[PDB]
Amino acid sequence: AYVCREASISGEIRYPQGTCPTKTEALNDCNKVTKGLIDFSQSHQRAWGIDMTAKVQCAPCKTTDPWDVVLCTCKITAHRYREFVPKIPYSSFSSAPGVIFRQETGLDHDPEWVVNMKARTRGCDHHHHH
């Protein structure tokens, strides 16, 4: 059979000036892109598989500063990613529904799937029992 690998993709989500998301809502937003990616993967021959999980970090809001824009880094990890399938670019899915994160502040390039070459290969299909 084919082996999959772990992969992650990172992006930024910004908030309206003078506002402040709870960590909960930020993770929730981030999980909108999780769902988005699972749907795209799904309709694209499960290139990224369907097992994805999200973590998020935000800057502290400034209670004070009124033109404060809070930046969150959203990071989705795909657990049964097919590195043997051609690499799908951000340009192909940045419009897709749920895909609300964007190029990161300070980064001169787009969000990209990054394969974790240190993690152990795993099945491409999940098996619930045996």
Coordinates of N, CA and C in Angstrom, one line a residue:
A1 N 0.8 -1.2 0.0 CA 0.0 0.0 0.0 C 0.9 1.3 0.0
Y2 N 0.2 2.4 0.0 CA 0.9 3.7 0.1 C 1.0 4.2 1.5
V3 N 2.0 4.9 1.8 CA 2.1 5.4 3.2 C 1.9 6.9 3.2
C4 N 1.2 7.4 4.2 CA 1.0 8.8 4.4 C 2.0 9.3 5.4
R5 N 2.0 10.6 5.7 CA 2.8 11.3 6.7 C 2.1 12.4 7.3
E6 N 2.6 12.9 8.4 CA 2.0 14.1 9.0 C 2.4 15.4 8.3
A7 N 1.5 16.2 8.1 CA 1.8 17.5 7.5 C 1.0 18.7 8.2
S8 N 1.6 19.9 8.2 CA 0.9 21.0 8.7 C 0.9 22.2 7.8
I9 N -0.1 23.1 8.0 CA -0.1 24.3 7.2 C -0.5 25.4 8.2
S10 N 0.2 26.5 8.0 CA 0.0 27.7 8.9 C -0.5 28.9 8.2
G11 N -1.3 29.7 8.9 CA -1.9 30.9 8.3 C -2.2 31.9 9.4
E12 N -2.6 33.1 9.0 CA -2.9 34.1 9.9 C -4.3 34.5 9.8
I13 N -4.9 34.9 11.0 CA -6.3 35.4 11.0 C -6.2 36.7 11.8
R14 N -6.8 37.8 11.2 CA -6.7 39.1 11.8 C -8.1 39.5 12.3
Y15 N -8.1 40.3 13.4 CA -9.3 40.8 14.0 C -9.6 42.3 13.8
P16 N -10.8 42.8 13.8 CA -11.1 44.2 13.5 C -10.5 45.0 14.5
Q17 N -9.9 46.2 14.1 CA -9.2 47.1 15.0 C -10.1 47.3 16.3
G18 N -9.4 47.5 17.4 CA -10.0 47.8 18.7 C -10.9 46.7 19.2
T19 N -10.7 45.5 18.7 CA -11.5 44.3 19.2 C -10.5 43.3 19.8
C20 N -11.2 42.3 20.4 CA -10.4 41.3 21.2 C -11.2 40.0 21.3
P21 N -10.7 39.0 20.6 CA -11.4 37.7 20.5 C -10.9 37.0 21.8
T22 N -11.8 36.1 22.3 CA -11.4 35.2 23.4 C -10.6 34.1 22.7
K23 N -9.8 33.4 23.5 CA -8.9 32.4 22.9 C -9.9 31.3 22.3
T24 N -11.0 31.1 22.9 CA -12.0 30.2 22.4 C -12.5 30.5 21.0
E25 N -12.9 31.7 20.8 CA -13.4 32.1 19.5 C -12.4 32.0 18.4
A26 N -11.1 32.4 18.8 CA -10.0 32.3 17.8 C -9.8 30.9 17.4
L27 N -9.7 30.0 18.3 CA -9.6 28.6 18.0 C -10.8 28.1 17.2
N28 N -12.0 28.7 17.4 CA -13.2 28.3 16.7 C -13.1 28.7 15.2
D29 N -12.6 30.0 15.0 CA -12.3 30.5 13.7 C -11.4 29.6 13.0
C30 N -10.3 29.3 13.7 CA -9.3 28.5 13.1 C -9.8 27.1 12.7
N31 N -10.7 26.6 13.5 CA -11.4 25.3 13.2 C -12.4 25.4 12.0
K32 N -12.7 26.7 11.6 CA -13.5 26.9 10.4 C -12.6 26.5 9.2
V33 N -11.3 26.9 9.2 CA -10.4 26.5 8.2 C -10.1 25.0 8.2
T34 N -10.1 24.4 9.4 CA -10.0 23.0 9.5 C -11.0 22.3 8.7
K35 N -12.3 22.7 9.0 CA -13.4 22.1 8.3 C -13.3 22.4 6.8
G36 N -13.0 23.6 6.4 CA -12.7 24.0 5.0 C -11.7 23.1 4.3
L37 N -10.6 22.8 5.0 CA -9.6 22.0 4.4 C -10.0 20.5 4.2
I38 N -10.7 20.0 5.2 CA -11.2 18.7 5.1 C -12.1 18.5 3.9
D39 N -13.0 19.5 3.7 CA -13.9 19.5 2.6 C -13.2 19.5 1.2
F40 N -12.2 20.5 1.1 CA -11.4 20.5 -0.1 C -10.6 19.2 -0.3
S41 N -9.9 18.7 0.7 CA -9.2 17.5 0.6 C -10.2 16.4 0.0
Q42 N -11.3 16.4 0.6 CA -12.4 15.4 0.3 C -12.7 15.4 -1.2
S43 N -13.0 16.6 -1.7 CA -13.4 16.8 -3.1 C -12.1 16.8 -4.0
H44 N -11.0 16.5 -3.4 CA -9.7 16.4 -4.2 C -9.0 15.1 -3.9
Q45 N -9.7 14.0 -3.9 CA -9.1 12.7 -3.8 C -8.3 12.6 -2.5
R46 N -8.9 13.1 -1.4 CA -8.3 13.0 -0.1 C -6.8 13.2 -0.1
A47 N -6.3 14.2 -0.9 CA -4.9 14.5 -0.9 C -4.3 14.8 0.4
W48 N -5.1 15.4 1.3 CA -4.7 15.7 2.6 C -5.3 14.9 3.7
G49 N -6.0 13.8 3.3 CA -6.8 13.0 4.2 C -7.9 13.8 4.9
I50 N -8.6 13.1 5.8 CA -9.7 13.6 6.5 C -9.5 13.8 8.0
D51 N -8.3 13.4 8.5 CA -8.0 13.6 9.9 C -7.1 14.8 10.2
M52 N -7.8 15.9 10.6 CA -7.1 17.2 10.8 C -7.4 17.8 12.2
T53 N -6.4 18.4 12.8 CA -6.6 19.1 14.1 C -6.0 20.4 14.2
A54 N -6.5 21.3 14.9 CA -6.1 22.7 14.9 C -5.5 23.2 16.3
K55 N -4.5 24.0 16.2 CA -4.0 24.7 17.4 C -3.9 26.2 17.0
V56 N -3.9 27.1 17.9 CA -3.8 28.5 17.6 C -3.1 29.3 18.7
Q57 N -2.4 30.3 18.3 CA -1.7 31.3 19.2 C -2.1 32.7 18.8
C58 N -2.4 33.5 19.7 CA -2.7 34.9 19.4 C -1.8 35.9 20.2
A59 N -1.7 37.1 19.6 CA -1.0 38.1 20.4 C -2.0 38.6 21.5
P60 N -1.5 39.1 22.6 CA -2.3 39.7 23.6 C -3.0 40.9 23.0
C61 N -4.3 41.2 23.3 CA -4.9 42.4 22.8 C -4.4 43.5 23.7
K62 N -4.3 44.7 23.1 CA -4.1 45.9 23.9 C -5.4 46.6 24.3
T63 N -5.8 46.5 25.6 CA -7.0 47.1 26.1 C -7.0 48.5 25.6
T64 N -5.9 49.2 25.7 CA -5.7 50.6 25.4 C -5.8 50.9 23.9
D65 N -4.7 50.8 23.2 CA -4.6 51.1 21.7 C -5.8 50.8 21.0
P66 N -6.5 51.8 20.4 CA -7.8 51.7 19.7 C -7.7 51.2 18.2
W67 N -6.5 51.4 17.6 CA -6.3 50.8 16.3 C -5.5 49.5 16.3
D68 N -5.6 48.9 17.5 CA -5.0 47.6 17.7 C -5.7 46.5 16.9
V69 N -4.9 45.9 16.0 CA -5.4 44.7 15.3 C -4.7 43.4 15.8
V70 N -5.5 42.5 16.5 CA -5.0 41.3 17.0 C -4.8 40.2 15.9
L71 N -3.5 39.7 15.9 CA -3.1 38.6 14.9 C -3.1 37.2 15.5
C72 N -3.8 36.3 14.9 CA -3.6 34.9 15.4 C -2.9 34.0 14.3
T73 N -2.0 33.2 14.8 CA -1.5 32.1 14.0 C -2.3 30.9 14.2
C74 N -2.8 30.4 13.1 CA -3.6 29.2 13.0 C -2.8 28.1 12.4
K75 N -2.8 26.9 12.9 CA -1.9 25.8 12.4 C -2.7 24.5 12.4
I76 N -2.9 24.0 11.2 CA -3.7 22.8 11.0 C -2.7 21.7 10.8
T77 N -2.9 20.6 11.4 CA -2.1 19.4 11.2 C -2.9 18.3 10.6
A78 N -2.5 17.9 9.4 CA -3.1 16.7 8.7 C -2.4 15.5 9.0
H79 N -3.1 14.5 9.6 CA -2.5 13.3 10.1 C -2.2 12.1 9.1
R80 N -3.0 12.1 8.1 CA -2.8 11.1 7.0 C -2.8 11.7 5.6
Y81 N -1.7 12.6 5.5 CA -1.4 13.4 4.3 C -0.7 12.5 3.3
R82 N -1.1 12.7 2.0 CA -0.5 11.9 0.9 C 0.6 12.7 0.3
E83 N 1.8 12.5 0.8 CA 2.9 13.2 0.2 C 3.2 12.7 -1.2
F84 N 2.7 11.5 -1.5 CA 2.9 10.9 -2.8 C 2.0 11.5 -3.9
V85 N 1.0 12.3 -3.4 CA 0.2 13.0 -4.4 C 0.8 14.4 -4.6
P86 N 0.7 15.0 -5.8 CA 1.3 16.3 -6.1 C 0.8 17.3 -5.0
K87 N 1.8 18.2 -4.7 CA 1.5 19.2 -3.6 C 0.6 20.3 -4.1
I88 N -0.6 20.4 -3.4 CA -1.6 21.4 -3.8 C -1.3 22.8 -3.1
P89 N -1.2 23.8 -3.9 CA -0.8 25.2 -3.5 C -2.0 26.0 -2.9
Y90 N -1.7 26.9 -2.0 CA -2.6 27.9 -1.4 C -3.5 28.6 -2.5
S91 N -2.9 29.0 -3.6 CA -3.7 29.6 -4.7 C -4.9 28.7 -5.1
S92 N -4.7 27.4 -5.0 CA -5.9 26.6 -5.4 C -7.0 26.5 -4.3
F93 N -6.8 26.9 -3.1 CA -7.8 26.8 -2.1 C -8.1 28.0 -1.2
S94 N -7.4 29.1 -1.4 CA -7.5 30.3 -0.6 C -8.9 31.0 -0.7
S95 N -9.7 30.5 -1.6 CA -11.0 31.1 -1.9 C -12.1 30.2 -1.3
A96 N -11.7 28.9 -1.2 CA -12.6 27.9 -0.7 C -13.2 28.3 0.6
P97 N -14.5 27.8 0.8 CA -15.2 28.2 2.0 C -14.5 27.7 3.3
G98 N -14.6 28.5 4.3 CA -14.0 28.2 5.6 C -12.5 28.6 5.6
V99 N -11.9 28.7 4.4 CA -10.5 29.0 4.3 C -10.1 30.5 4.6
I100 N -10.2 30.9 5.8 CA -10.2 32.3 6.2 C -8.8 32.8 6.6
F101 N -7.8 31.9 6.8 CA -6.5 32.4 7.2 C -5.8 32.8 6.0
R102 N -4.7 33.6 6.2 CA -4.1 34.2 5.0 C -2.6 34.2 5.2
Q103 N -1.9 34.7 4.2 CA -0.4 34.8 4.3 C -0.1 35.5 5.7
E104 N 0.9 35.0 6.3 CA 1.3 35.5 7.7 C 2.0 36.8 7.6
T105 N 1.7 37.7 8.6 CA 2.5 38.9 8.7 C 4.0 38.6 8.9
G106 N 4.9 39.3 8.2 CA 6.3 39.0 8.3 C 6.8 37.9 7.4
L107 N 5.9 37.2 6.7 CA 6.3 36.1 5.8 C 6.1 36.5 4.3
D108 N 7.2 36.3 3.6 CA 7.2 36.7 2.2 C 6.6 35.6 1.3
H109 N 5.9 34.7 1.9 CA 5.2 33.6 1.0 C 3.9 33.2 1.6
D110 N 3.1 32.5 0.8 CA 1.8 32.0 1.2 C 1.9 30.8 2.1
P111 N 0.8 30.6 2.9 CA 0.6 29.4 3.7 C 0.9 28.2 2.8
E112 N 1.6 27.2 3.4 CA 2.0 26.1 2.6 C 1.9 24.8 3.4
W113 N 1.4 23.7 2.8 CA 1.6 22.4 3.4 C 3.1 22.1 3.6
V114 N 3.4 21.8 4.9 CA 4.8 21.3 5.2 C 4.7 19.9 5.8
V115 N 5.4 19.0 5.1 CA 5.5 17.6 5.6 C 6.5 17.4 6.7
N116 N 6.0 16.7 7.8 CA 6.9 16.5 8.9 C 7.8 15.2 8.6
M117 N 9.0 15.4 8.1 CA 9.9 14.3 7.7 C 10.5 13.6 8.9
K118 N 10.3 14.1 10.2 CA 10.7 13.4 11.4 C 9.7 12.4 11.9
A119 N 8.4 12.7 11.7 CA 7.4 11.8 12.2 C 7.4 10.5 11.4
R120 N 6.9 9.4 12.0 CA 6.8 8.1 11.3 C 5.7 8.1 10.3
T121 N 6.0 7.5 9.2 CA 4.9 7.2 8.2 C 3.8 6.4 8.8
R122 N 2.6 6.6 8.3 CA 1.5 5.8 8.8 C 0.5 5.4 7.7
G123 N -0.5 4.6 8.0 CA -1.4 4.2 6.9 C -2.0 5.4 6.3
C124 N -2.6 5.2 5.1 CA -3.3 6.3 4.5 C -4.8 6.2 4.8
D125 N -5.2 5.0 5.2 CA -6.6 4.7 5.7 C -6.5 4.5 7.2
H126 N -7.5 5.1 7.9 CA -7.6 4.9 9.3 C -8.4 3.6 9.5
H127 N -7.9 2.8 10.5 CA -8.7 1.6 10.8 C -9.1 1.6 12.3
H128 N -10.4 1.6 12.5 CA -11.0 1.7 13.9 C -10.8 0.5 14.8
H129 N -10.7 -0.7 14.2 CA -10.6 -1.9 14.9 C -9.6 -2.9 14.4
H130 N -9.3 -3.9 15.2 CA -8.5 -5.0 14.8 C -7.9 -5.7 16.0

